[PDB]
Symmetry: C3
Subunit: 124 residues, 3 copies
């Protein structure tokens, strides 16, 4: 497997890679609303989701892929009431044909953020 590393997304501090290229796919770690400089982006679901989308885009690009190549996303929210806003921003980055998706609300996410999104995309 090949690890993907880019400064355009929050650095991977720990036992994980921003993304891994393997078997024709790109497995992207769950992105949170953290700026590449390590600053946490707070605010409503729309502002936080925008940062998550930018991180995903940045990692996918560094992997030689892109948003249009994403085939599956796994989305976690901390509040069911944030679904509408999340979907609106999500739709600003992902356009038809859309990826397959699974979304759920959980107790908490890394650093207390409102949203975390991981994905799988086609390589190349």
């Amino acid at each position: 497997m090949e690890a993907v590393k880019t400064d355009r997304a929050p650095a991977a501090i720990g036992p994980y890679a921003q993304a891994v290229k393997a078997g024709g796919f790109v497995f992207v770690s769950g992105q949170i609303p953290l700026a590449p400089d390590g600053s946490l982006v707070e605010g409503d679901i729309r502002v936080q989701t925008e940062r998550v989308m930018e991180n995903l885009k940045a990692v996918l690009e560094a992997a030689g892929s892109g948003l249009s190549r994403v085939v599956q996303t796994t989305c976690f929210l901390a509040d069911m009431e944030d679904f509408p806003g999340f979907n609106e921003v999500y739709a600003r980055y992902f356009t038809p044909p859309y990826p397959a998706r699974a979304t759920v609300a959980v107790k908490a996410l890394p650093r207390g953020v409102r949203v975390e999104v991981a994905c799988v995309a086609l390589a190349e």
Copy 2:
């Protein structure tokens, strides 16, 4: 990629495709207890899981795949107490060799349903 669309399963209730075929796999979105016409299927876990299973089956068939080709499922339930009933119905649709699986109880699911099941299957 290659999008999968069928009227035999509920239409997507967000910016996502029912399933996506890519790299030899079929990535199926998290299915919830909605009837093909989009109406909610209320009831206990056995009733709602049956609806989810039929939706999975329909999407998989439309993708040229099937339940026996599923290699991994990601199952989310809103109530840990629903695990027994979920497993019973699940066992009516998936038979050995069973898919690899992750079953976790979470805070909330789309439309406030009891269960959401996404999966990955072999395209052939």
Copy 3:
């Protein structure tokens, strides 16, 4: 698809296989702090995580793969305060390049365990 079955990891109790080999990948079911004979390992996050890691390792090896072939992990914790410890033990089982990862916190896990981890790896 080929179901993986080994006695070196907690036996699958329910409608699922410990892992499935398909499409060049190995899909591993969620593992919790259970010993091979079925005994529950309690204690702090470090001790419980070790058992989970050993379970993943055993299943992966039984599948003809290994920890170094893991490309993606999905981790669930019952207490976000346990993340530091979970991350440290997790790091003991992986070496660069590390897998892509998604981590979330849930209210509670089966049998009150502190952690659960599922993953996907290359079949070598």
